[PDB]
Amino acid sequence: VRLSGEARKQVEVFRQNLFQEAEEFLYRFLPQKIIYLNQLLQEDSLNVADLTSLRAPLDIPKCGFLPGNEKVLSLLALVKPEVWTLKEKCILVITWIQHLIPKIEDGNDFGVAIQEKVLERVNAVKTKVEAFQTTISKYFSERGDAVAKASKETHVMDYRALVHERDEAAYGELRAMVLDLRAFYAELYHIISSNLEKIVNPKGEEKPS
Amino acid sequence: VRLSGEARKQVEVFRQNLFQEAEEFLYRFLPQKIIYLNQLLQEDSLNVADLTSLRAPLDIPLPGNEKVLSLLALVKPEVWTLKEKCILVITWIQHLIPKIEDGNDFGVAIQEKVLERVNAVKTKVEAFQTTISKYFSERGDAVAKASKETHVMDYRALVHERDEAAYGELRAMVLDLRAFYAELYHIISSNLEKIVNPKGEEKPSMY
Amino acid sequence: NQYDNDVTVWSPQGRIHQIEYAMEAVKQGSATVGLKSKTHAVLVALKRAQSELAAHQKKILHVDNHIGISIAGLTADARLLCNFMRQECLDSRFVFDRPLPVSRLVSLIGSKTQIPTQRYGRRPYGVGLLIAGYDDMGPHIFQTCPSANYFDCRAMSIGARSQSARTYLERHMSEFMECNLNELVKHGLRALRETLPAEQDLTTKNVSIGIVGKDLEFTIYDDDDVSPFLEGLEE
Amino acid sequence: TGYDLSASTFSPDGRVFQVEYAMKAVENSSTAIGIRCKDGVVFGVEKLVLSKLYEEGSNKRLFNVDRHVGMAVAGLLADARSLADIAREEASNFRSNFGYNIPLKHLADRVAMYVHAYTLYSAVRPFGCSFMLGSYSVNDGAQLYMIDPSGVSYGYWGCAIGKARQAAKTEIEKLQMKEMTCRDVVKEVAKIIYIVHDEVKDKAFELELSWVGEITNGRHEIVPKDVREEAEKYAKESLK
Amino acid sequence: LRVQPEAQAKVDVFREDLCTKTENLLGSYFPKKISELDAFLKEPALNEANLSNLKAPLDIGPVNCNEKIVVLLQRLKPEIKDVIEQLNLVTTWLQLQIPRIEDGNNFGVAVQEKVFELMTSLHTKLEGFHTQISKYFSERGDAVTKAAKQPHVGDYRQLVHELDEAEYRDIRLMVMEIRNAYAVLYDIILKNFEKLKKPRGETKGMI
Amino acid sequence: SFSLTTFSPSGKLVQIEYALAAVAGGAPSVGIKAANGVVLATEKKQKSILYDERSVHKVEPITKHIGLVYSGMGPDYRVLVHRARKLAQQYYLVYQEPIPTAQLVQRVASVMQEYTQSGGVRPFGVSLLICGWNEGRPYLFQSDPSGAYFAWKATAMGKNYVNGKTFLEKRYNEDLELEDAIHTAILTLKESFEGQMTEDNIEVGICNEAGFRRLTPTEVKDYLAA
Amino acid sequence: MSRRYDSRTTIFSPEGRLYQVEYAMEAIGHAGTCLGILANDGVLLAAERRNIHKLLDEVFFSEKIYKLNEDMACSVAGITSDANVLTNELRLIAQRYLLQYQEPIPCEQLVTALCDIKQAYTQFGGKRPFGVSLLYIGWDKHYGFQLYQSDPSGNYGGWKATCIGNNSAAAVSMLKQDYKEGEMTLKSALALAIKVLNKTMDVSKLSAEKVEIATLTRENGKTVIRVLKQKEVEQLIKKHEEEEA
Amino acid sequence: SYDRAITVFSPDGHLFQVEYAQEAVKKGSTAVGVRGKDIVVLGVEKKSVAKLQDERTVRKICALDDNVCMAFAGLTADARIVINRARVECQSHRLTVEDPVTVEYITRYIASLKQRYTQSNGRRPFGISALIVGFDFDGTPRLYQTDPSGTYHAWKANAIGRGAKSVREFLEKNYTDEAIETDDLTIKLVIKALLEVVQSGGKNIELAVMRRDQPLKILNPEEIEKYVAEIE
Amino acid sequence: FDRHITIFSPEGRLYQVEYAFKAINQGGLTSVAVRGKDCAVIVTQKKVPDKLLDSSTVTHLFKITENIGCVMTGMTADSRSQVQRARYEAANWKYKYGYEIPVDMLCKRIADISQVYTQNAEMRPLGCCMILIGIDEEQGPQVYKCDPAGYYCGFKATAAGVKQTESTSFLEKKVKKKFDWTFEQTVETAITCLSTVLSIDFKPSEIEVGVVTVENPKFRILTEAEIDAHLVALA
C-alpha cells in the first residue's frame, strides 16, 4: 500500500509509546507494586486472626440506616485500584508483545510460540484479575440484597448469619486478592524478564544466505 | 432390491429441475441480490449515526417508531429469502454426495465444508431475525417500564440507546447479507468442479 | 510412553525399558537354586509340567564334563543361547583341548547379550542362567542377566519366591563350605522348599539335581538316585 | 515434541538430548576417583555390596585395558564391559601395528572417537558409561584422562566419576597432589572414599584401590590386601 | 445362553417386519410423500407475498388468531408426526442390521455407524421443528397478554404481528425442511441399500 | 530406504512441489540467447566488505563451449557441479568429443529424477540454467528440480522471475547482436536487482564461437556506463 | 530405518485397491490430450501441446511422441520425469529383444515386458510407482498394424481407437460414433482425428504449432514413420476449416 | 535395499493384508470351470466395450501346458507374473522328469509362491485366485484353485470372481452323477451356470474346452449362440 | 516431520540445518581470525574451568598441516571429529595431487562432506564450523570459514561463536577506514575485538593465538611469554 510520511510517524510514535510503557512497567511498576502489596499484607488490617469479630451485624426492623462493614469497605478501596492498574498495564504488555510477532511463517515459530505462551499466562492472570473485580462488586450485590432480604424477613434470622458469611468470605478474599495480586506482579516479572530474550528476539536469525 | 418400481423417477424433480433451478440461483439470483442491497445501502436512514436524529419522539413521564419498521420492511425479507435459498443449497449439495466408497473423499470433504458454511450463514440470519424480534421485546419492555418510571431520568434516557443500536445493527446486517451473497457464489463456483463431480470415475474396470 | 518402543532410545532418566522388560521375563520362569562348597557344587532345578498328563520339562542342560547350567526364562531363547554356549565350549576343546574356564564362558555369554542391546531391531535375549562348574580353583556359581550383567556367587536362587530361599542361603552360608556331597544335597533340597508353594512340596518326579566335584564329573540325577536323597530330610 | 527421540534429530536449541540422558544415567553410578602425582597415578573405586550372598572379589570395578593402562568405569556395566574389550582390541591392534604400548593420549582419542560414532547414527544408541584412563611411563610420566558419554577427553590432575564428583574434586583442590607420592596419595584416596559414603541410602561397600607408577614399576597393578588395610588405618586415624 | 426356537423366531419376524416396512418406505412411502409435499408447498397459502394481511389485529375477551396461519400449522404438524415415526422405523431397522463385533470386516460397520448417526441428528431436528410450533403458541399468547398488561405500548402488538410473520415464515421453511427430511432420509437409505444392506461378511474364503 | 516422495490425493508430488517453490525465491538470474552468443548475468551479493569476491564465483563453466548458472541452494549446486562435470568427463572418455548441450542437460536432469524415487534422500533444491555452444548454433536451456528441461530464447529465474520474463517478452525480440544482448540482459537485470549496481554485485559471462568465458570486472564496468 | 517414515505403499484398501496406483492415474488425468487410431492402410497418432509461449524453442521433434524402434512408436501422457526412464527402458527392452531374437519386436511383447517392471515396483522395493500412461503404435509380421494402451498399474489392452489425458472420455464417446471398423483407411482416419481434436479441445484457434500429428505406415516392405511439418499441418487446418463451417 | 516385515499378526491372529487381498479377488470378473468325464470346460465373462478393445489381448484363459490350462480372476497384472513363472517352472519340471506334469505337482508350486511372497520381507501378497485344470495320467481330470493365503484345494466344480458363491449354489445343487456324464451335458451345465450371471451378456461370454490328449480348444462365438439356442 | 529429518519445509528451508547452526552457539566460546598483508592470525579463548584440568591437553587451535592453521567453533565432539577427517582429506590431497592442499580446496572438500550429511537423511550434520587460515604462494594469505551448511567464502576477517555481529561490527571499523594490516597491528585488532565485547581484558594464560607469516609459513602457537610481549605493548 501507499501512505504519507506523516502516517509513518503516527505509527512510529505509537510503537515508541508502547516501548516506553512496557519497559517502565517491567523495571519500575512491577517492583514497586510487589513491595506495595507486601506492605498491605503487613498492615494490621489484614493481619487480624479473629474473623468472627470482623462481622458487621445490622439491626433487623423512620427506620435506621444500614451501613456495610466499615473495614471491608475501606479495604475494597485499597484493592480496587490495584485490580484496575494491574489489568490496564497487562493489556499494554499484551499489546506490546503482540507487535513483536514477525510476518507469519510456516516454521521457526518457537519464539512466536513462546510469545503466545507468555500472552496465554497473562490472559490467565487477566481473567483472574477480572474475577477479583467481580468479587469487589459481589460483596455489594450479595450483602445488599441479603440484608434487605434479612430486613423484610424477621422470622428467619440466620439470613444475617449468611450476611455474616459474606463478611468473613470478603475479608478472607481481601487478603487472598492482595496476596494473589502481589503474586501476579511477581509472576509477570518472572515470566517477562526471564523470557525477554525470546520475546524481543523470537528468531535466532541463523540464515546462512 | 424388492422395491416398488414406481415414483422412483420423482427424484429427477430435485436432482435435475430444482437442481438446475438452484444453478440459476448462483450466477443470477445471488448477484441480483448483491446489487439489490447496494441500492439498500444508499438509504440515509441507516447512514445516520446521530442518536437524537435517529431516535423517535418519546412521550413518557405512547408513540412507537415506524421509521425502523420501514427499514425492517426491507431487512426482514432479505434475511429470510437468503435463509430459504440456503436451504436449497443444502439440498443442492445433498444430491451431489456420492455413494459410500474409500477413496475420492477430497471432493466429499469440500461438500461438507461448504454445506457447513451454508449452515453458518443460516445461523447468522436466524440471529438477525432473533435480534429483529428483540427490537419489539426489549424496546417494548423498555418504554413499558419507562412509563412506570418518572423520577428516574437514567433508565428513561437509556431507552433510546437501543433505538440507535437498532439502526446501526440493521445496516450491519445488510452489509453482512451482501457478504453472504458474495461468499455463497464465490465459494461454490471456486469448488464447483469437485462439488458437482466429486468422483471422476476414471478407474479402470480391470476386467 | 514413547520411550519403551525400542532399546536404543534412552528414557529422560537414562534407562532402557526394554532391558527392564527383559529382566522381568526371567522372573516369570521356574525357580531354581544352586550352591557350592569348598569341594563340590550342586544345582537343584525345579521342573514344571504344562498339564497333569504332560511330563515335566527339563530345566537342566549338560554343557561340559565339569560344567552344568540351569535355565530360567524363555525356553527357546535359552536353546539358541545354549547352542552358543555349547559351541564355545566345544570350540574350547576343539582349539585349546581343555575344559573352558567357567568364568571365561560366562564372559562370552555376556558378549553375546551385549550385541543386541546397542543395535536397533535386535531384541536382547530374555533368558536368565544359573551356571556352575569346577576348575583348578574349585567350584564356581555364576549368574547372568539379560542386561548382560554377570556376577560370581557362592550360592544363588533365581525365579519366583527366591528370597525365602536366599534368606535360608544367608543363614547356612557358613555351613555350605564344610559340608560334604551328601549334605549339600540336603541343604539344596531344603533350599528349594522355600521357593515352593504350601501345598505341593517335594516329589522325585518334578525335582531333579546335578552335582560336579573334585574328581567327580557333572552328573544328572532324576528319580532313582534322587529318591534316597529326599529320604531323611525334614522340611 | 519428538525432537529428543533420535540422536540424529537436533533439538530446537541445537543440542542432542539422547547424549544428555546417557550422561544422567552415569550420575546414578557409584563413585570412583583417581589422582596423579610425580610418583604415579593412584586409583580408587567405591564398590557397593549388594548382598552378603556375593563372593569376595565379585563385581570387580577395577578394569585393566593394557599393561601400563588402568581404567575405572562408572555407568552401565553392560556398556562398560563392551567398551572394555573394545579398548583392549584397540591397544592390542596398536601393538599388532606399531609394536609397543599405546600412549594414553593416543588411546583416549581412538576410544572417544568410537564413542562419538554411535551418537551420530539413529539406528544405534550412545554409551551410557563414563570412565577415566590412567597411565605411567618414564618418557611421558603420570597421566590421567577422562572420557564422557559424548566422547570427549580432558586431561586431569584428578577426576571423580559417578554420583558424587564435584564434592570430591573440590577436596582435591584443597591440597597439592603433585609433590605427593603414591604412598601418601592412597591415604587421601581412602580418606575421600569415607567422606563420600555415609549411611543413608547405601548400606555397605568395599575399598578397591589400584596403583601405577614407580611402586608398581610403571605397570598397572592392584593394591594388595595388606597395604589396603594399612592404608585404611591411616584414614581411620581421622575418620575414626 | 440357551436358544429358544420359538420366541427368538418371533424376534426374527419383528426384524423382517421392519425390513418389509423399510422396503415399503423406500419404494412407496418416501418418493410419494416427497412429491406430495412439493405440491403442498405450491399451495398459494404458502406463496403469500403480503404478510401484512397475516398480521392478526388485537383489540386492546376480544382476542383471536390468524385462521390462515393456524390451519397451515394444522396442515404441517401431521407431516411432522409422520416423518418422526417413519424415521424411528428406520432408526430401529438400522441398529438391528448391525452384525456382531469383530476385528475384521469393520469397513461396512463404520459405515452403518455414520448412517445411523445421521438419522439421530434428523430426529433431533424434527423434534425441534415441532417444538417451535408449540413455542410460538406460548410466545404469541403471552405477547398478547403483555399487550393487555400494558394497554399503551404498541410494540407488543407489533411483536404479535412479528410473531405472526415469524410463524408463517417458519411454516414455509419447515415445509421445505420436512420435505428435505424426506429427501435426505430417502437419498441416504437408497444410497445405502442394494449391496450396502449387507456390505461386508458372507464372503470369507473358499477353504 | 523408503521413498520420501509420494503421490498426493491430487496426484501431484508433494516433495518436488516445495523444491520448485524453493528455487522461485533464490538469487535473481537472467539469460538471453541472441545472434551468435548467449549472455548470462547473475547476482552475487555480499553482506559485508570482508567477503572476498575472487574466492567464490556463482557463474561456473562446465567445459570450454558450455557454461552454467543457477538460482537456489548453494550446497546442492556444488553436488550438481561435480556430477555434471564428471558426466562431461565420462562423456569425453567414451566419445572423445565436446559434449552437446542437449545430451548434457538430459542425463544431468535424470540425476534430479533419481532422488524423486530412491528412498532416504531429498530432491535437489537447485534449478539449473545451462548455456552451450555446438556446431555454430547457440543453446540456452532451463532445468528445474523436477527433471524436466526446456529450451528458451530468453528467460528469468530467481526472485521476481515473472517480471523478468514479461520484460523480455516486451523488450526482447529477434535481430539483436551480442552487444545488444548484453545491454538488454543488463536492463532486465536492473529491474529485478535493487540498489546500487557495481561490477562486484553482478557476475556476467558469455558463450560464443570462442567458447564460454567469464567477464572480468574491468570490462563489466565498461558496460555499467550504459 | 525408522518405521515412522514408512508409508507402506503395499497396504491394500478395505476395498482391495492401491492408493499410490490410484493417485498415479489422477496425475495422468491432468496430462494433455493424446489419441491414436488404428486404420487399414496405417496407424495415426496425434496429440496437443499444452506448453505455449512465445519464447519456446522446440527445435527438437515432437513433444509427447517418441520412437521406440524402426517398426514401433509411442506417445506420452504423464509426468515427463518418469516418461524419460520409461522411454529409455522401453528402448532398452526392445533392443535386448534384438540381442537374442535378432528380429523386430512384436508389439505385444514390448508392452508386457514393461508392465512386468511396473508391477514389480508396486509389489516390493518401497519405491513409488510410475505416473506415466503410454500409447503404442507400430507394425509386426503377425498381427500387422497395432495400437495399444498402457496404465501405470501394469494393465494393458489392445485398442482400435482410444484417447488418454484430458478430454479422454469425450474423444472415446466420439470414437463410438464416427469410427468405422474395417472401412475407413489411414486417409479418412486423418480427417476424422482432426475433427475430434478440434471439437474436444475447448481452446480456440488451433494452429500447426499448438498441435502435433505423426503417421506410421508400411510402404514397399519398409516401415515409414514421419511427423507432419507445420506447413503440412496448416494445409490440413485449411481442409478442416472448410469442412467445419 | 528395502527389508522389513509387511504381513504381521493382529490381536485375533487374522491377517489384514491377506484378507484385503481376497477382497480384490471377489471384485474380479466371474470365471468358472467344471470337471467332465474325459473333458474339462473353462469359461469367463468378458466386459468389452464398443467394439473398440481388441479381443486378442483380453483372454483370461491360459494354458500352462498341453495337458494343463488355467483361468484367473483378480488383478490382471499379478496374473501375468504368476502364469509366466508357473510355465517356467512347469517346463523346468519336464526337464527334471521326462513324464509330463501332474496337475497336483504344478498347483503345489504355484500356491507356494503365494505362500512365500506373502510372508517374505518387503514383498506383497497376490490379489489373484486361479483355477488350474488339466488331465493326469490315464486321462483323469483335476481341478485346483489357489488362495492369496497360499492354500489350495481340489474341486469337482468351482467358480471365482463376483458372484462366485452364487455360481457354486447352482453347481452344488445341480452337480450329480447324472451331471458331466457326456459331452452334451458338460457343455450345457457350464453354460447354464453362466446364464444366471448374464447381464447384457450375449456373445461376450467366452468358453474353452480340452478333450483327452487333444490341446486346449476355444469354442467360437457362433457355436456359443447355437448351444445357448437350446435352453429347453 | 521436516523438523525431525532433513527434508524440505513448507517454505523450502531445512530445519535440521538451522539447528546445526544453533548448535554452534552451544559451545560457549568465541573466536576471531584476521587476514593480514603478510600474516594470518587466529585468536580464541582458552577455557580451563577445573584446576585439575590439564591446560596442555585443552587446545582450541588445531593444525591441519604445516602452512594451514585451524580453529573450531561449535560442539566439541563434532569439532574434533571433523578435524580428524580434515586431516584424512588433506593427506589424501597430497597422496593424489602431489602438493600441499590450498585453503580454498580444503574448505571445499570439507564443505562437500557437510553436503552429504544434508542431502542424506541417514547421517546427521555436524554442529561445528571450521575456520581455516593459510598463505597461498600466488594470492598470498588465505583465510576461509565453512559453516555446517557447506557455505564458504573468502573473508578479510572471520567471526564465530556467541559474539558474531558485534565482533564483525568492530572489524567493520578497521576495513572501512582502510587500516594498515601488519603482524602486530592485526594482533592489536584481534585482542581488542574480543576484549571489548566480553568486557574482560584477557590475560596471556587465558587465550591462545596461532600465527602464520610469509617469513614463517609454518603454523605456530604463540607462547605466553610472547603473548604477554604482545599484550603490554598492545596496552
CSV table of N, CA, C and O in Angstrom, one decimal, chain G residues 32-61:
chain,number,residue,atom,x,y,z
G,32,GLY,N,-2.1,-33.6,-21.0
G,32,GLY,CA,-2.7,-33.1,-22.2
G,32,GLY,C,-3.4,-34.3,-23.0
G,32,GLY,O,-3.1,-35.5,-22.7
G,33,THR,N,-4.2,-33.9,-23.9
G,33,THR,CA,-4.9,-34.9,-24.7
G,33,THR,C,-4.0,-35.6,-25.7
G,33,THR,O,-3.3,-34.9,-26.5
G,34,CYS,N,-4.0,-36.9,-25.7
G,34,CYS,CA,-3.3,-37.7,-26.7
G,34,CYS,C,-4.2,-38.9,-27.1
G,34,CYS,O,-4.8,-39.6,-26.3
G,35,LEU,N,-4.2,-39.1,-28.5
G,35,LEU,CA,-5.1,-40.1,-29.0
G,35,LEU,C,-4.4,-40.8,-30.1
G,35,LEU,O,-3.3,-40.4,-30.6
G,36,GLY,N,-4.9,-41.9,-30.5
G,36,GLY,CA,-4.4,-42.7,-31.7
G,36,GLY,C,-5.5,-43.5,-32.3
G,36,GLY,O,-6.5,-43.8,-31.6
G,37,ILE,N,-5.3,-43.8,-33.6
G,37,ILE,CA,-6.4,-44.5,-34.3
G,37,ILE,C,-5.7,-45.6,-35.2
G,37,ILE,O,-4.7,-45.3,-35.9
G,38,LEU,N,-6.2,-46.8,-35.1
G,38,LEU,CA,-5.8,-47.9,-35.9
G,38,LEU,C,-6.6,-48.0,-37.2
G,38,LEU,O,-7.8,-48.1,-37.1
G,39,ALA,N,-5.9,-47.9,-38.3
G,39,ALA,CA,-6.6,-47.9,-39.6
G,39,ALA,C,-6.0,-48.9,-40.6
G,39,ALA,O,-5.0,-49.5,-40.3
G,40,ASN,N,-6.7,-49.2,-41.7
G,40,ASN,CA,-6.3,-50.3,-42.6
G,40,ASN,C,-5.0,-50.0,-43.2
G,40,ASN,O,-4.1,-50.9,-43.2
G,41,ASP,N,-4.8,-48.8,-43.8
G,41,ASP,CA,-3.5,-48.5,-44.5
G,41,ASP,C,-2.4,-47.9,-43.7
G,41,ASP,O,-1.4,-47.5,-44.2
G,42,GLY,N,-2.7,-47.8,-42.3
G,42,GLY,CA,-1.6,-47.2,-41.5
G,42,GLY,C,-2.2,-46.9,-40.1
G,42,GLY,O,-3.4,-47.1,-39.8
G,43,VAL,N,-1.3,-46.4,-39.2
G,43,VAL,CA,-1.7,-46.0,-37.9
G,43,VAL,C,-1.4,-44.5,-37.8
G,43,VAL,O,-0.5,-44.0,-38.4
G,44,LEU,N,-2.3,-43.9,-37.0
G,44,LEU,CA,-2.2,-42.4,-36.8
G,44,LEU,C,-2.2,-42.1,-35.3
G,44,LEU,O,-3.0,-42.7,-34.6
G,45,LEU,N,-1.3,-41.3,-34.9
G,45,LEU,CA,-1.2,-40.9,-33.5
G,45,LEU,C,-1.0,-39.3,-33.5
G,45,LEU,O,0.0,-38.8,-34.1
G,46,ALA,N,-1.9,-38.6,-32.9
G,46,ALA,CA,-1.9,-37.2,-32.8
G,46,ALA,C,-2.1,-36.8,-31.4
G,46,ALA,O,-2.7,-37.5,-30.6
G,47,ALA,N,-1.6,-35.6,-31.0
G,47,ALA,CA,-1.7,-35.1,-29.7
G,47,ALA,C,-1.6,-33.5,-29.7
G,47,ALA,O,-1.3,-32.9,-30.7
G,48,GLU,N,-2.1,-32.9,-28.6
G,48,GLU,CA,-2.0,-31.5,-28.5
G,48,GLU,C,-0.7,-31.1,-27.8
G,48,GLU,O,0.1,-31.9,-27.4
G,49,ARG,N,-0.5,-29.8,-27.6
G,49,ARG,CA,0.7,-29.2,-26.9
G,49,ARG,C,0.2,-28.2,-25.9
G,49,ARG,O,-0.4,-27.2,-26.2
G,50,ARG,N,0.3,-28.6,-24.6
G,50,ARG,CA,-0.2,-27.7,-23.5
G,50,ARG,C,0.8,-26.5,-23.3
G,50,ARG,O,0.3,-25.5,-22.9
G,51,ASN,N,2.1,-26.7,-23.4
G,51,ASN,CA,3.0,-25.6,-23.2
G,51,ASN,C,3.0,-24.7,-24.4
G,51,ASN,O,3.4,-25.2,-25.5
G,52,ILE,N,2.6,-23.5,-24.2
G,52,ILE,CA,2.6,-22.5,-25.3
G,52,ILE,C,3.2,-21.2,-24.8
G,52,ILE,O,2.6,-20.6,-23.8
G,53,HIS,N,4.3,-20.8,-25.4
G,53,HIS,CA,4.9,-19.5,-25.0
G,53,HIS,C,5.6,-19.0,-26.2
G,53,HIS,O,6.1,-19.7,-27.0
G,54,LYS,N,5.7,-17.6,-26.3
G,54,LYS,CA,6.4,-17.0,-27.5
G,54,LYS,C,7.9,-17.3,-27.5
G,54,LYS,O,8.5,-17.2,-28.6
G,55,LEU,N,8.5,-17.5,-26.4
G,55,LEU,CA,9.9,-17.7,-26.3
G,55,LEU,C,10.4,-19.2,-26.4
G,55,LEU,O,11.5,-19.5,-26.2
G,56,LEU,N,9.4,-20.1,-26.5
G,56,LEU,CA,9.8,-21.5,-26.6
G,56,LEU,C,10.5,-21.8,-27.9
G,56,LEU,O,10.4,-21.1,-28.9
G,57,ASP,N,11.4,-22.8,-27.8
G,57,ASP,CA,12.2,-23.2,-29.0
G,57,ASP,C,11.6,-24.3,-29.8
G,57,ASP,O,11.1,-24.1,-30.9
G,58,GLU,N,11.6,-25.5,-29.2
G,58,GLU,CA,11.1,-26.7,-29.8
G,58,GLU,C,11.8,-27.0,-31.1
G,58,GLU,O,11.1,-27.4,-32.1
G,59,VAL,N,13.1,-26.9,-31.1
G,59,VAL,CA,13.9,-27.2,-32.2
G,59,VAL,C,14.1,-28.7,-32.4
G,59,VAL,O,14.8,-29.1,-33.4
G,60,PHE,N,13.6,-29.5,-31.5
G,60,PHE,CA,13.7,-30.9,-31.5
G,60,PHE,C,12.7,-31.5,-32.5
G,60,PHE,O,12.8,-31.2,-33.7
G,61,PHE,N,12.0,-32.6,-32.1
G,61,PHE,CA,10.9,-33.2,-33.0
G,61,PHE,C,9.5,-33.0,-32.6
G,61,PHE,O,8.9,-31.9,-32.9
